């Protein structure tokens, strides 16, 4: 009928956008690319024939059982768990255009433009429609379709946890000039049965192996020197220099690294249930040197491998430790929001200025490839300034390090092209139809019916079909062996220490970094599975792409890792998060496009709030029937 959403017979309503919402566009400029990045690839294979189209059949040609055997536990639970994200997409890609497009087909909101791509989104649903419920059904059983392929992965795992470690305690919060033989008395006396073998304070360690390590460096640049002058006949001069410096400095600190006392402690016990009675006590006892030692302000928490324990970073500690990662953060934050606007905005730079016809709608390539390309570059860079920014940040546990390097890139990127995208495409979507008001109208307020995004939806397509065809790809290229490009400029002949170079190689695989990189692009395509419905076909071709390409790097081209259990833990936490997220964003666009008073926002505010309770307990009270089920 009179839909009145920017019909074109009146302004032409150049906030329209472009026909099939540029898709197809990108889907060959990247796509081209993609049949350009792979034959590249291939040059560069050139290089591994240089002592030290065949990898086509080389990623078919593998099996289950050469990939477990080489490679260890740790790569194949990771293909599993692909393996069950690519079911999942499976039944949600078959389900969502099985009976969600159809649904979203119906209607007529943008049905007056043939080309527009809004017809499959959300955005052409009526304001009231009984029918609409199934959206708000659809995201809630799929949440569901979240927990029970889950369940069905996190099923197929052992121990990894045998000892579960009861051993020693890292007690912190002790008095800084206590002595060992103090703590020792007052565990014997305190416990009724207790064998302290032994108790060892920790001094301020930092500036030791902070000289040490730069005295060792010093020493291998040295011995590296000496024996190329050895074979050709000041570097040797200054790198000495440097190690006289370095190793009297060594000995100066030394002679003073015990006037250092940190006041926290390792305590090892010869029993491990003494251990779990003292920790529970815990979380005291007094002795004859209980008020000497302040016990009441000690922290008492199971002791991490001596291997896993950061010595140097143990000094910055309390208050001062918080303040640093707090500031690291919003560093972080402020450049995450540096590197996000421009998408938005080279994005949204036509739609300013409504008064425009349609044909000033520019090229799809300038508005939707050109800020998709650089969307997916910034995010695939940013895993590495995040964990880069990890060394600067004092965090203790090597182990801890590792879950909170993952869990911090993961919601920066999901910062980064989730939720700050949308966002703000939200806010210079409602700017443009309340602007849509001043030029040729007499209504007093937004009809707030089509408000859904400035392309609705489809800079979301294209961000995941970007980081398919280009960010796979990218990431076969993205091998140790790139340092295999540069050489080839830098001279003509020596082709001896070329090689040389090649053979660093040896990353583990940081798991990480492809968990949350997988995350990010699940996230975005379960989040919007139920709003813009075309996106999941295009997220299955990702995350095949994704399971090829990692599974080729994993048995050819990656040393084999031995990573912590407590990852994988994680990621499934992950990806139980991202239906939360779907749901959220569910709640928010049906709260703009009717309100609270809509049945269909309450229904899905309600089960939001039945989710995130039953997901807050878990931590607390977990029990069975919820996910995270690892045996």
């Not at 830098?490 to 798991?511: G, M, P, T």
Request: hydrophobic share 45%; charged share 20%; aromatic share 16%.
């Amino acid at each position: 009928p009179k839909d009145y959403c920017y019909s074109a017979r009146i302004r032409s309503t150049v906030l329209q956008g472009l026909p099939f919402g540029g898709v197809p566009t990108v889907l060959a400029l990247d796509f081209m690319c993609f049949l350009a990045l792979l034959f590249l690839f291939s040059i560069l294979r050139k290089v591994a024939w240089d002592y030290g189209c065949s990898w086509l059949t080389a990623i078919f040609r593998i099996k289950d059982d050469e990939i477990r055997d080489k490679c260890g536990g740790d790569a194949v639970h990771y293909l599993s768990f692909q393996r069950h994200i690519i079911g999942l997409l499976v039944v949600v890609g078959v389900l969502s255009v099985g009976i969600v497009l159809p649904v979203n087909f119906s209607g007529d909101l943008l049905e007056n433009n043939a080309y527009s791509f809004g017809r499959t989104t959300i955005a052409n649903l009526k304001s009231g429609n009984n029918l609409l419920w199934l959206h708000t059904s659809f995201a809630f059983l799929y949440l569901l379709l979240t927990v029970y392929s889950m369940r069905r992965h996190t099923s197929k795992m052992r121990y990894k946890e045998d000892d579960l470690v009861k051993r020693t305690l890292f007690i912190n919060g002790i008095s800084k000039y206590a002595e060992s033989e103090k703590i020792k008395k007052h565990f014997e006396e305190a416990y009724p049965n207790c064998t302290v073998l032994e108790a060892r304070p920790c001094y301020n360690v930092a500036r030791l192996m902070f000289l040490d390590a730069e005295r060792k460096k010093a020493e291998r640049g040295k011995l590296y020197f000496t024996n190329l002058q050895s074979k050709e006949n000041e570097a040797i001069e200054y790198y000495t220099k440097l190690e006289q410096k370095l190793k009297e400095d060594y000995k100066r600190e030394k002679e003073k690294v015990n006037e250092k006392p940190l006041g926290m402690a390792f305590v090892t016990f010869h029993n491990e249930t003494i251990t779990a009675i003292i920790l529970k006590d815990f979380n005291p006892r007094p002795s004859s040197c209980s008020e000497s030692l302040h016990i009441s302000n000690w922290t008492v928490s199971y002791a991490p491998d001596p291997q896993n324990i950061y010595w140097e970073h143990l000094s910055i500690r309390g208050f001062i430790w918080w303040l640093r990662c707090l500031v690291i953060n919003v560093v972080l934050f402020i450049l995450l929001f540096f590197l996000t606007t421009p998408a938005i905005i080279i994005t949204t730079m036509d739609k300013f200025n409504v008064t425009k016809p349609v044909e000033y709608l520019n090229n799809p390539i300038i508005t939707q490839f050109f800020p998709t390309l650089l969307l997916w570059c910034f995010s695939a860079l940013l895993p590495t300034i995040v964990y880069y920014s990890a060394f600067f940040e004092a965090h203790w546990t090597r182990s801890g390090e590792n879950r909170t390097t993952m869990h911090k890139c993961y919601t920066f990127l999901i910062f980064m092209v989730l939720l700050l995208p949308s966002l703000g495409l939200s806010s210079l979507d409602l700017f443009f139809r309340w602007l849509f008001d001043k030029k040729f109208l007499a209504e007093a307020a937004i009809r707030f019916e089509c408000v859904f995004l400035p392309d609705n939806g489809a800079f979301f397509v294209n961000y995941v079909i970007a980081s398919a065809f280009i960010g796979n790809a990218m990431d076969l290229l993205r091998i140790p062996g790139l340092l295999m490009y540069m050489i080839r400029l830098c001279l003509a002949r020596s082709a001896a220490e070329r090689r040389n170079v090649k053979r660093h190689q040896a990353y583990e695989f940081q798991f990480g970094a492809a968990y949350a990189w997988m995350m990010c692009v699940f996230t975005v395509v379960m989040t919007y599975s139920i709003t813009c419905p075309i996106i999941v076909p295009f997220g299955l071709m990702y995350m095949l792409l994704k399971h090829l390409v990692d599974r080729y790097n994993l048995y050819y081209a990656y040393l084999p890792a031995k990573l912590d259990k407590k990852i994988h833990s994680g990621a499934v936490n992950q990806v139980v998060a991202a239906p939360i997220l779907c749901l959220f964003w569910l709640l928010f666009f049906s709260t703009m496009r009717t309100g609270f008073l809509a049945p269909t926002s309450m229904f899905t505010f309600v089960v939001l709030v039945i989710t995130i309770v039953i997901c807050l307990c878990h931590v607390c009270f977990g029990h069975f029937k919820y996910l995270s089920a690892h045996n």
